[PDB]
Design brief:
part of a larger assembly, 4 chains, A: mainly alpha, B: mainly beta, 3% helix, RNA-binding, Rib_uL2_dom2 (chain D), structural constituent of ribosome (chain D)
Chain lengths: 123, 142, 187, 258
RNA sequence: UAUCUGGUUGAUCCUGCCAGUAGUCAUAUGCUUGUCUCAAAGAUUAAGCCAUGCAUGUCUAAGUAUAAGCAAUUUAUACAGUGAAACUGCGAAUGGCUCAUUAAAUCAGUUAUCGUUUAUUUGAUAGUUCCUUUACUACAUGGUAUAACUGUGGUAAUUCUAGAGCUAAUACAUGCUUAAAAUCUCGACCCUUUGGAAGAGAUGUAUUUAUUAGAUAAAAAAUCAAUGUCUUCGGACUCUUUGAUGAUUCAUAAUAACUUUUCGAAUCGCAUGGCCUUGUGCUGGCGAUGGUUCAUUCAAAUUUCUGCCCUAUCAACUUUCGAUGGUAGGAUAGUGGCCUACCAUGGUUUCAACGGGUAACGGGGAAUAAGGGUUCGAUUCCGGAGAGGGAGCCUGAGAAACGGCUACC
RNA sequence: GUCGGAUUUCCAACGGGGCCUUUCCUUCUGGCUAACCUUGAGCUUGGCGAACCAGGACUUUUACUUUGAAAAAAUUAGAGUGUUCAAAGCAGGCGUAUUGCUCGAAUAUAUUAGCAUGGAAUAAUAGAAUAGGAC
RNA sequence: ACCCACUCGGCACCUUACGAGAAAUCAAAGUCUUUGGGUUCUGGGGGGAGUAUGGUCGCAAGGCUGAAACUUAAAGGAAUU
RNA sequence: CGCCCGUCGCUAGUACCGAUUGAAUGGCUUAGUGAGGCCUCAGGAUCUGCUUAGAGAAGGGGGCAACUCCAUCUCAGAGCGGAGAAUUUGGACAAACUUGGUCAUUUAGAGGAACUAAAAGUCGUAACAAGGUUUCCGUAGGUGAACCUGCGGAAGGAUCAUU
RNA sequence: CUAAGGGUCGAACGAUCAACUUA
């Protein structure tokens, strides 16, 4: 009779699973960023869809809106904190212009490569 | 109606005693109460002779809670009439309303005069009968 | 036992209500008392939340009060002569609320003789002063005094015997006495 | 169900208790007492999760059995005693007296009062009646019965109970220009002044309480608690005094504090 | 992340369906299976049936002990330390499990109890109980068992029980013990008659009945039936008293009675202190238990408004023998056809009544998607029903209880 | 006018309130008498009551819409938070680290029905016609 | 009674296609993805089948309401060669 | 030399009808019988309190001679009472059984009449061209079979055309 | 035993009569 724990699925399978154009796109991304499962690409796209949906819902509200402002800066502050959005792009419109590569670059795997301690993403 | 005493028992206001050895004003004592909510007691309930222990102004019933309104569709019972209340239920699916009606049986007092096709307001009181749970407080007709 | 719910009865639309619950205890109902007269036998029935109720059977004597005079004297009962609801109660002489009993009324006559100093039909300054002071009020209606010459007045039990274990009431006087007298007299 | 219920699962407990949802499936159901279960605070949760003096359930029991706390003058020994609004817990050890006052956010507080302040408790009377033997009495919000009160005292006012002697020493009438304390509802914990009220003789009397920052809100008369006149509170107000800043102002306050 | 494709034709554009596609707190199964965290799990058919073992018993400083139980009192001659069993007081009606029944029923939001009960708590609350009330009676205090226990036993078996002998209570059944004043009733007497009265009874609370008060928007005069305060009896007359509610025959008070009679402490644990008329004299604390009434709280039970799946190859339903309403009475803790006696013939319905099916407990919610919506919801939370199918009942504040009994299949 | 924050008279716009133009959009007892014609030498005694209330009064009806109280939690969206990331959870953070101190534990949605509330568009609704019509 | 001009209601007709439709074609079959003037009825792949049964009307023949099991990946519409 | 229709015959499946006052299962229910708990009218085993109540006879105190006073092992006899089971009259609640009725769910059945699936069964050629009798719609009759014929209507015709 | 089914002479009213039935 204890309160049940909450679980959620963090990835979204593509509606079209069988397409050469998308298939090669994720293979290029996975190989460049060193990813084994394409569910990792499915996961990171799922997070992008959620924040885009939340940001889109904010953009249908007028300016000087307490709900739009508070959640708008909070989402913007989180994005600039994690490093996916530059300081001069904090205007709530570039948030909709974020891509998967920008989020993938912030992963610790790529940062280890960038600082020069692995010599290869697989390493 | 025609006769105040038309039953086997003697109809009287409970615990109201008229002393047979005095000649005080307004002969038989007629206890009356004010329902409230701006509902004035009709003069018939003040100078009348009916008892109607369930009357909202001369009986013992206390009126509290909802104060509904509706027209009169039937008057074939004794001291009790049926009212019809019309509302508009909203269906969330096809973005509009529909007409619906409910027949609420209410208790009426001999002081009031209600006919078929009369908008009346009824107040909630204690259960008077199996289906009757409202009392007429004010008839609205010219 | 006897149920007291509204789930075993037809609805206002004539529909037959289906069974929902077994007969609950907070809707229980016990049997009628049917109180007789003489040889007092009062039983007790345990009710909800304690509060014992005295079930009355065969009550011999009760309390009756003269509203006009304002007194209340113990008086023996001797049967009922009129009952509005049913007539078999009159035949069986069962004591229930709102029943026209025919009381002994002997103490009431004794009180009147000892209070206002007058006799119904049929030497001390302290007593005489009250008797003279209480004048102009020793005259009552003809019906009550006529029944006093009969040594019996009519009354009406105003206390529920089964629920309270006591049957109390008042002596009829006024329009009620005239009303009930006509029904008894009516041919 | 065939009688009363003595249990409280850890999902139907009042949300202002700030209880978790993983440490057990039950909640400390308060026993019958001065206040309702949904409008009070058990002694166990207050000492275990608020003051953090006790860790486990038995530690609260050991502390309570040792005759340390004193609620409204009485020592008390029940772990589920329903201490609610206007309840003062006095601790002989640690030299602290604690008063249960709602916060702006919607929960209880740990407001500390001086020993002089703990000697008196404010109480909102609920009923005034002429009891048996013709003696008048009043019924405060805590259920205390005080005989022979001031005739000027009527319904919906506040009295200053002496606690130690249980006698009324001061009464505050309900009128315009009175500082109150909202107890219960989505607007609970707000402190403001009364400007006017619409009587609405059908139930649920409403009063327009105005904050010191020109903010106005509507709260039913059953959820109000007059705590003094305009500008002078008869009780030491909690920190913040019910300003009720918005989510934007709160965030700037945090960023101005870190 | 507001997306389609393949298939009728020699070929084309359509309608149209099939199939493909992705997801499922929707399951089942197959193949394979290395790790960390979290975690569902005899619901679907059978609310089918159950071996066996458990699932509710319980004490303090403070109800009752001489265990013919255990240590030691050495502060205790009656125990007074610990303490099985038993009596007693409470709890066992919570929790847990299942979704069979049930389609204005349950249930959800929302009202009322001025129409009711309420253990346990919280805050208050019994100078009035000796009734020819002067010997009629212990009030520095009354009576009666009984369990455990000792011994006799019975039956194959049972949480089966008897006969004999004790003993206890916060066990049963009785029961008194503190002032002073105030009115109602009485009234022996003085009896001048403006009239005063020695002395006696009752007045707490609880149940029942009848009556009264429970109120009071604004200012001045003519008289009386008898002057009423004080008197120049020319009359100044003010002084006077009852709260709340939108609203009550409300709370409350006083009269006249009713009770076979409710309560008004014969209970218990610590520390033992003061006054002296120097005494088992008189006062005296911190508590526990219980108790009548009110309020409060945990509740319980009725109840105002709106809202539930598919069906007309269900169009009229209900009232024999309760249906609609009224009167009066029973019963209930209360309102009420809940029931009874009489009277009137009403009440519902195409605005979807009634009847039938439900792989129907309902809701909070779950899956699915731009929006709209569709489907599911036994299942952790809330409100309901049941203990195999029904009926009946004791105890208790609370059960129509089944890990309580009684009867039938 | 402070050093990419923030001011005074502003060209401008935008929602609100009040007043007048034939446009009462209820007033009686009251006390505040209010804005007091009240004026004492310039901080002064006496204007029409809701702008503060207690009460009588006609308060013709809605459908609709704005706002507020109300919609138990869990759940959903979602603020903050190094479960090491994450599913989660509501924890945590900071010292002179021997005395300790302290921000949190939000917010939002929640059908229909019920309650109050400002408005008057939209859609109906009754008023005074062999005048039983209003001051 | 005819000629000319105008007007209202008609049975309709000729030419174009703004516009609609899959096209044949349409002064509506137009003012429908720039989707909303008011209202009624009917249809959800082709067979089984307007069959079986149950109601209802009729002297009968027959009319109204009206399925399911089962089977199939096609039938069907307009045009081109 | 395309497509296609029906009767009849063989094989299988599905559904309908069907005499058998069919069968089985479950719900509802008239009536009869009616357990049991409960409430009432009685009942009285049994236990126990109180009031006298005389005697078989000891004991002590008093006239000390007969005689007198109360306690005792003992037994009748009379009432004043309290608790009080088995049993019992009546009443309401009402399990269950029997007998029927009704509703709903499956199922046997000679035979009758259909539909569907059936590589190359028989007979005829009804429809698609003016399909060789233009088709189709209704109605009635007839015929192994498609189908034919009578009456009325339609073009979905083979005629947008006779001032 | 109760209730119900009439004539009748003069707010509906007081007298008078006999009759077979039903619940």
């Amino acid at each position: 009779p204890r309160a049940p724990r909450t679980y959620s699925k963090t990835y979204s399978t593509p509606k079209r699973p069988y397409e050469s154009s998308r298939l090669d796109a994720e293979l290029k991304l996975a190989g460049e960023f060193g990813l084994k499962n394409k569910k990792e690409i499915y996961r990171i796209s799922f997070q992008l869809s959620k924040i885009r949906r939340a940001a889109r819902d904010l953009l249908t509200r007028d300016e000087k809106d307490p709900k739009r402002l508070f959640e708008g800066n909070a989402l913007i502050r989180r994005l600039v904190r994690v490093g996916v959005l530059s300081e001069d792009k904090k205007k709530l419109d570039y948030v909709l212009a974020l891509k998967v590569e920008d989020f993938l670059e912030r992963r610790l795997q790529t940062q280890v490569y960038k600082l020069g301690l692995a010599k290869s993403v697989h390493h | 109606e025609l006769t105040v005493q038309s039953e086997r028992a003697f109809q009287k206001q409970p615990h109201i005693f008229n002393n047979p050895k005095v000649k005080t004003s307004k002969r038989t004592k007629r206890w009356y109460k004010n329902a409230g909510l701006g509902f004035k007691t009709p003069k018939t309930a003040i100078e009348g002779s009916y008892i109607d222990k369930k009357c909202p102004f001369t009986g013992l019933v206390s009126i509290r809670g909802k104060i509904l309104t509706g027209t009169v569709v039937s008057t074939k019972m004794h001291r009790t009439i049926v009212i019809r209340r019309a509302y508009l239920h909203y269906i969330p699916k096809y973005n509009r309303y529909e007409k619906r009606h409910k027949n609420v049986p209410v208790h009426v007092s001999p002081a009031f005069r209600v006919q078929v096709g009369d908008i009346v307001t009824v107040g909630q009181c204690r259960p008077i009968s199996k289906t009757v749970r409202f009392n007429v407080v004010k008839v609205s007709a010219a | 036992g006897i149920s007291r719910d509204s789930r075993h009865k037809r609805s206002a639309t004539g529909a037959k209500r289906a069974q929902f619950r077994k007969k609950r205890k907070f809707e229980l109902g016990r049997q009628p008392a049917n109180t007789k007269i003489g040889a007092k036998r009062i039983h007790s029935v345990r009710t909800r939340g304690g509060n014992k109720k005295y079930r009355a059977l065969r009550i011999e004597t009760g309390n009756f009060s003269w509203a006009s005079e304002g007194i209340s004297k113990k008086t023996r009962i001797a049967g009922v002569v009129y009952h509005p609801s049913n007539n078999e109660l009159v035949r069986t002489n069962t004591l229930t609320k709102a029943a026209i009993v025919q009381i002994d009324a002997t103490p009431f006559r004794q009180w009147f003789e000892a209070h206002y100093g007058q006799t119904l039909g049929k030497k001390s300054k302290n007593a005489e002063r009250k008797w003279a002071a209480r004048a102009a009020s020793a005259k009552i209606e003809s019906s009550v005094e006529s029944q006093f010459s009969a040594g019996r007045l009519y009354a009406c039990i105003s206390s529920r015997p089964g629920q309270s274990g006591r049957c109390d009431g008042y002596i009829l006087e006024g329009e009620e006495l005239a009303f009930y007298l006509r029904r008894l007299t009516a041919k | 169900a065939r009688g009363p219920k003595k249990h409280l699962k850890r999902l139907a407990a009042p949300h202002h208790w700030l209880l978790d949802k993983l440490s057990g499936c039950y909640a400390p159901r308060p026993s019958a007492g001065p206040h309702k279960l949904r409008e009070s605070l058990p002694l166990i949760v207050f000492l275990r999760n608020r003051l953090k003096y006790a860790l486990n359930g038995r530690e609260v029991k050991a502390i309570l059995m040792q005759r340390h706390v004193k609620v409204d003058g009485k020592v008390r020994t029940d772990t589920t005693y329903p201490a609610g609004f206007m309840d003062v817990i006095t601790l002989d050890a640690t030299n602290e007296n604690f008063r249960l006052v709602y916060d702006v956010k919607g929960r209880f507080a740990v407001h500390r009062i001086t020993d002089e302040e703990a000697s008196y408790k404010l109480g909102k009377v609920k009923k005034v009646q002429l009891g048996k033997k013709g003696v008048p009495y009043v019924v405060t919000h805590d259920g205390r019965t005080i005989r022979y009160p001031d005739p000027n005292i009527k319904v919906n006012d506040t009295v200053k109970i002496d606690l130690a002697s249980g006698k009324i020493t001061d009464f505050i009438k309900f009128d315009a220009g009175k500082l109150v304390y909202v107890t219960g509802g989505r607007n609970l914990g707000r402190i403001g002044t009364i400007v006017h009220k619409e009587r609405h003789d059908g139930g649920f009397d409403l009063v327009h309480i105005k904050d010191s920052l020109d903010n106005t809100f509507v709260t039913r008369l059953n959820n109000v608690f007059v705590i003094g006149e305009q500008g002078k509170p008869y009780i030491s107000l909690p920190k913040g005094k019910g300003i009720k800043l918005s989510i934007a102002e709160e965030r700037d306050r945090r960023r101005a504090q870190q």
